[PDB]
Amino acid sequence: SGFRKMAFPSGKVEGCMVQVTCGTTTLNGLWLDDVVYCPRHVICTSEYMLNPNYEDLLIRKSNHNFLVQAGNVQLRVIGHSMQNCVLKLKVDTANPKTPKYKFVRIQPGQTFSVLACYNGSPSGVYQCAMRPNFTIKGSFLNGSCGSVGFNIDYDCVSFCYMHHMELTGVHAGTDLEGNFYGPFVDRQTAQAAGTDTTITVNVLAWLYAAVINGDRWFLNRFTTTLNDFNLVAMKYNYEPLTQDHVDILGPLSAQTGIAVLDMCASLKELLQNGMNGRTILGSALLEDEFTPFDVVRQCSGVTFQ
Amino acid sequence: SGFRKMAFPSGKVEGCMVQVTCGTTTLNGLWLDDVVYCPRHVICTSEYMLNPNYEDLLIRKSNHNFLVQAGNVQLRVIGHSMQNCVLKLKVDTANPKTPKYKFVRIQPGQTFSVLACYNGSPSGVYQCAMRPNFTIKGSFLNGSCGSVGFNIDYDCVSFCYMHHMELTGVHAGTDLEGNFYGPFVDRQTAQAAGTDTTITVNVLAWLYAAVINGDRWFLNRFTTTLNDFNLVAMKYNYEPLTQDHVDILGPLSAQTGIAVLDMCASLKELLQNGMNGRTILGSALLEDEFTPFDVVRQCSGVTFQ
Ligand SMILES: *[C@H](O)[C@H](C[C@@H]1CCNC1=O)NC(=O)[C@H](CC(C)C)NC(=O)OCc1ccccc1
Numbered sequence: 001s002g003f004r005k006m007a008f009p010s011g012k013v014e015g016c017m018v019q020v021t022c023g024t025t026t027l028n029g030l031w032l033d034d035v036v037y038c039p040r041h042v043i044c045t046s047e048y049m050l051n052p053n054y055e056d057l058l059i060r061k062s063n064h065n066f067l068v069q070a071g072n073v074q075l076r077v078i079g080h081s082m083q084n085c086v087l088k089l090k091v092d093t094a095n096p097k098t099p100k101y102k103f104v105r106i107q108p109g110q111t112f113s114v115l116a117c118y119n120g121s122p123s124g125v126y127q128c129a130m131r132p133n134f135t136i137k138g139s140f141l142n143g144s145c146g147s148v149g150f151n152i153d154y155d156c157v158s159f160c161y162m163h164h165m166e167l168t169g170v171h172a173g174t175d176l177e178g179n180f181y182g183p184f185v186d187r188q189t190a191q192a193a194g195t196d197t198t199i200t201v202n203v204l205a206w207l208y209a210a211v212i213n214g215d216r217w218f219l220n221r222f223t224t225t226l227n228d229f230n231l232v233a234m235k236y237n238y239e240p241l242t243q244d245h246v247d248i249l250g251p252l253s254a255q256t257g258i259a260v261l262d263m264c265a266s267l268k269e270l271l272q273n274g275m276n277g278r279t280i281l282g283s284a285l286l287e288d289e290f291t292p293f294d295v296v297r298q299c300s301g302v303t304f305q
Numbered sequence: 306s307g308f309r310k311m312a313f314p315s316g317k318v319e320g321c322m323v324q325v326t327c328g329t330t331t332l333n334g335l336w337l338d339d340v341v342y343c344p345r346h347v348i349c350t351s352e353y354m355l356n357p358n359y360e361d362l363l364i365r366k367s368n369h370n371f372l373v374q375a376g377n378v379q380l381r382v383i384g385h386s387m388q389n390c391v392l393k394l395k396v397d398t399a400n401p402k403t404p405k406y407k408f409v410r411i412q413p414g415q416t417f418s419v420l421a422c423y424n425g426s427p428s429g430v431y432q433c434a435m436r437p438n439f440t441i442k443g444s445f446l447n448g449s450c451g452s453v454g455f456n457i458d459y460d461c462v463s464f465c466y467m468h469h470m471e472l473t474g475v476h477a478g479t480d481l482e483g484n485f486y487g488p489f490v491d492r493q494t495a496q497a498a499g500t501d502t503t504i505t506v507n508v509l510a511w512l513y514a515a516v517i518n519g520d521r522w523f524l525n526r527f528t529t530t531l532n533d534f535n536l537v538a539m540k541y542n543y544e545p546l547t548q549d550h551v552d553i554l555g556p557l558s559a560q561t562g563i564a565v566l567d568m569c570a571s572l573k574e575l576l577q578n579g580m581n582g583r584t585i586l587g588s589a590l591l592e593d594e595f596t597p598f599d600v601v602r603q604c605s606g607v608t609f610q
């Protein structure tokens with residue numbers, strides 16, 4: 001038993017990280033087969049980040065302007081191209097440690113692991129969610145650009161995120177085809193994230209994890225309707241709940257014998273009375289960064305090969 | 306910027322995990338050079354866990370009673386021995402993926418990463434601390450025994466923990482020489498953890514991380530003395546603060562220009578007035594599982610090779 005913010009093992013991703021230098025700008029790249037992927041703003045200078053014209057910047061470059069380092073080994077760039085906001089650098093050596101992979105675009109509310117890197121070198125791994133406003137609350141310093149986010153599916157690494165920029169305390173990036181999550185652009189202008197909301201289905205999955213681990217004090221005998229719940233959730237900035245969410249929570253209600261709409265009644269009380277100084281799973285706030293699948297995986301124990 | 310419960314990249318450890326089967330009991334083992342390390346209770350039967358005599362159990366076994374699997378490869382056990390509470394299984398193949406390693410015993414208050422495994426297969430990575438009562442608050446299901454805890458030092462993996470048992474919601478284990486943390490034994494008897502306390506030096510390091518990231522509301526102009534602080538800390542079950550702790554916090558006070566004893570005055574107020582419904586770094590409780598070194602690493606950005 002127990003419950004922890006758990007990330008995926010990062011070994012399969014660590015073997016794909018490289019250092020990409022262009023000029024005096026160094027960041028991380030992702031090396032799969034003979035392509036290195038990295039943020040396109042590696043080709044900006046400190047006198048361009050205000051309003052770059054990336055097509056102009058790229059035509060003025062040749063392959064030898066791109067220093068790609070894998071450990072102490074140098075990779076020769078033999079071709080480059082731009083795909084939306086990422087650069088694809090073709091190199092002469094296919095990465096022998098290339099795992100089975102796919103590129104997927106995730107939805108708000110889903111979680112993934114981030115392998116934070118500096119100078120091509122893995123520094124740390126942590127779990128986070130894509131927020132409803134298409135930012136993540138990460139931990140990134142200068143030089144972390146190009147760090148990637150990923151899930152693991154049995155044996156396949158699904159790459160879903162590449163890091164590009166910090167806004168005001170939060171973090172924004174692209175999928176691996178180079179398309180931004182959210183209405184952001186990769187230039188330094190005054191852009192801000194929209195209003196964040198609480199991911200309701202995730203809070204309910206976490207209350208089920210609590211019940212599974214012995215925390216029961218917030219339960220009650222009431223029920224509510226989907227519609228009566230969503231009227232209260234709206235007032236507290238919670239995402240509305242759909243019949244799809246109920247079905248997804250099905251495995252957890254079956255395991256605890258507590259109906260989804262029963263649990264919504266407890267959440268309604270917590271939202272109106274507060275925690276009153278008690279904690280749930282070691283937290284004094286309602287946690288919304290575990291999906292129903294995260295709870296199942298951790299409270300049942302799925303491995304990976 | 307940002308602040309996350311961050312674990313070490315697990316790649317170097319994933320290559321050392323194996324499945325160890327003896328009878329109908331399967332758990333994980335650690336494979337370094339030609340030795341596999343695992344909990345000695347793999348040689349217990351379901352009719353022995355009450356009060357085993359491990360020396361008797363071990364003499365009744367031969368090498369071929371031990372099935373060691375590395376992926377889909379079988380390792381031949383050519384010798385075994387007992388070292389306190391762990392089994393050392395000598396095998397015919399040295400692990401080619403053996404990293405540079407040391408075995409270290411950590412102290413209460415220090416943190417490490419746990420690679421939770423099932424059937425020799427890595428499932429997840431998370432960070433935790435060794436509590437003052439020598440338990441950890443982990444997340445472990447049946448079959449997780451043999452999972453290891455580790456720090457990474459530049460290029461060397463320091464192994465500090467092997468998992469053995471769950472008590473009442475918390476988790477207990479040994480160092481890699483087989484000696485338990487705390488006064489626990491590896492049998493099923495009624496043993497309980499002593500009283501846990503809050504790791505004061507870690508709470509202060511986390512308040513500094515908050516200041517570094519813009520959270521300043523709890524600061525004040527007061528100072529206190531080491532002695533006046535420890536009188537309040539005692540009442541709230543906080544570990545007493547020593548002059549060694551002050552010095553360790555030195556790098557963080559220098560970076561924020563806030564003296565250690567100034568910050569103790571703010572902590573004293575938080576302990577006496579409470580949070581009053583505000584949060585610090587996204588938490589409504591005082592967090593004690595980041596060491597001063599964890600804060601420096603994350604708020605400055607140390608990598609590993
Ligand atoms: C690449 O490592 C870096 C990521 C930042 C550095 C600090 N933390 C991060 O996540 N990227 C940039 O520096 C990026 C460059 C292009 C978008 C031109 N810009 C960026 O993040 O700075 C804009 C900003 C605005 C307001 C607050 C903080 C940053």
Ligand SMILES: *[C@H](O)[C@H](C[C@@H]1CCNC1=O)NC(=O)[C@H](CC(C)C)NC(=O)OCc1ccccc1
Nearest residue numbers: 354445446447448449450469470471472491492
């Ligand atoms: C090995 O994977 C397993 C670890 C437990 C299983 C559930 N979560 C864990 O961390 N080890 C055991 O089953 C262990 C066997 C030897 C110590 C004989 N015993 C154990 O943890 O059960 C004792 C216990 C007492 C009270 C509550 C829970 C467990």
